[PDB]
Design a protein around this ligand. Structure first.
Ligand SMILES: CNc1cc(N2CCC3(CC2)CN(c2cc(F)c(CN4CCC(C)(C)CC4)cc2F)CC(=O)N3)ncn1
Lengths: 244, 203
């Protein structure tokens, strides 16, 4: 069957028909034991000196609020590219950059290179419309096709899961990204200093430092935070037992 | 001339100016992805130097990319004069619709480039996700031809680095494993005779 034709016929996206969309439970349980307390800081990242965020991070998840997320303060790729991300990333570290579905797939690669990473994975969040087949999409002027996915670029600097997330398209104006991206990241066992830039009250999570303008509360303290990673815990992956 | 046409050639040396202008170009090039492959590859410089620019004035380019070609393909696309305006992914399933370095790969990527000011195309009919079964390894999914036909019905199209299974009405297919030269469009046939009077492409 040709599901592209079917989408033309009915309005059901082809991804609506993908099916199925203690093994790796020690992992997860080891992750949960390893996790630092959740930590969070309200900060206007535009006006904020990013270098106050210490220590250097093993993983950075970067989720800038793109204009395209508001179909019905936006950050342009001009703003994002000017962030000093390389100033806070560890010499060996990883970045996960939500890039949207338009020009961000190009400018986000420029950003990754600008900050010193190379792309090693491209994770696509594929959005089903099983609940509103009869909801046509209002296209970007340059679009050739209806855009039904977002890309999260994985980048590496220095020396179980699939690259797809499938969920239903959120309601209009819901900008949340699927929480599954956190599972993929934590399953990589990349180290324990994890930073989420442009997170929200609703994304705060154990094992993560969340920084963003709309946080209603803070508990960040750089000395307290650094203390979770002082010896003997400096090089844990986040997937092993705590050191007695 | 509507029915399938093809040319067995080395795309590095064919004079593509004899083919005229196309509404859609598609390529699944043999990129040097810095792994060992069962087919011959083109170097980065050979890819850059391909004479894609003479093939269109106003239309769309469909460019399959994997690995480091996700980046190199974007470079070639811009060098040849295109802006990347979309990106199609093909979710690979089995016959029961289940999905087949750091992550296992469930998809393949096709960049969509635009050149000039295309007019009369049907933009927005299809969406940018293909769900289809791996009918054979190394093969792109046939659905891409349907989406391109609905996007630009009846127009002239050219595929580079195609194989015999790829020949399609409205398409001229170029590849070095094709069976000879089969050209039916009278403009192309004339230009071919003039440029290649002995039916041989060399330098
Ligand atoms: C020297 N100059 C030439 C060369 C030439 N070709 C003829 C055709 C060519 C390469 C050489 C096709 N090739 C091949 C096989 C592949 F898997 C891929 C990768 N791609 C990735 C995306 C996908 C949808 C998964 C589908 C796969 C790309 C490929 F190009 C195998 C082959 O044997 N030949 N034609 C004229 N001139």
């Amino acid at each position: 069957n040709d599901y592209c034709q079917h989408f033309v016929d009915t309005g059901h996206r082809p991804q609506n028909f993908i099916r199925d969309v203690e093994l790796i439970r020690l992992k997860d349980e080891l992750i949960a034991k390893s996790n630092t307390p959740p930590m969070y800081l309200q900060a206007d990242i535009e006006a904020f000196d990013i270098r106050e965020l210490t220590p250097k991070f093993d993983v950075i998840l970067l989720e800038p609020p793109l204009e395209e997320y508001y179909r019905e303060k936006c950050w342009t790729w001009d703003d994002i590219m000017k962030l000093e991300i390389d100033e806070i990333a560890a010499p060996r570290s990883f970045i996960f950059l939500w890039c949207g579905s338009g020009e961000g797939l190009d400018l986000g690669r420029v950003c990754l290179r600008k900050w010193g990473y190379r792309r090693c994975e491209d994770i696509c969040w594929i959005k089903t419309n099983k609940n509103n087949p009869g909801k046509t999409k209002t296209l970007d002027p340059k679009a050739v096709f209806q855009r039904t996915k977002e890309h999260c670029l994985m980048g590496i600097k220095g020396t179980v899961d699939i690259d797809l997330i499938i969920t239903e398209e959120p309601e209009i104006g819901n900008i949340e990204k699927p929480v599954e991206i956190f599972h993929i990241i934590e399953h990589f066992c990349l180290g324990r200093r994890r930073l989420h830039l442009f997170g929200r009250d609703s994304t705060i999570r154990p094992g993560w430092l969340t920084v963003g303008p709309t946080l209603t509360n803070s508990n960040y303290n750089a000395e307290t935070y650094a203390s979770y990673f002082s010896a003997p815990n400096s090089y844990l992956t986040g997937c092993t037992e705590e050191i007695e | 001339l509507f029915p399938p046409q093809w040319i067995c050639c080395d795309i590095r040396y064919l004079d593509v100016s004899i083919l005229g202008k196309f509404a859609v170009v598609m390529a699944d090039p043999p990129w040097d992805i810095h792994m060992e492959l069962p087919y011959g590859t083109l170097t980065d410089d050979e890819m850059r130097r391909l004479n894609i620019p003479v093939l269109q004035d106003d239309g769309f380019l469909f460019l399959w990319v994997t690995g480091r070609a996700m980046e190199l393909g974007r470079e070639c696309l811009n060098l040849w004069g295109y802006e990347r305006v979309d990106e199609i992914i093909w979710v690979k399933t089995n016959q029961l619709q289940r999905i087949i370095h750091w992550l296992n790969h469930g998809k393949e990527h096709c960049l969509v480039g635009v050149k000039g000011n295309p007019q009369g195309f049907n933009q927005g009919l299809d969406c940018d996700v293909i769900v289809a079964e791996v009918r054979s390894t190394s093969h792109k999914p046939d659905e891409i031809y349907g989406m391109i036909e609905r996007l630009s019905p009846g127009t002239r199209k050219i595929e580079l680095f195609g194989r015999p299974h790829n020949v399609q009405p409205n398409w001229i297919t170029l590849g070095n494993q094709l069976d000879g030269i089969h050209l039916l469009d009278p403009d192309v046939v004339a230009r071919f005779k003039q440029r290649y009077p002995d039916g041989i492409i060399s330098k």
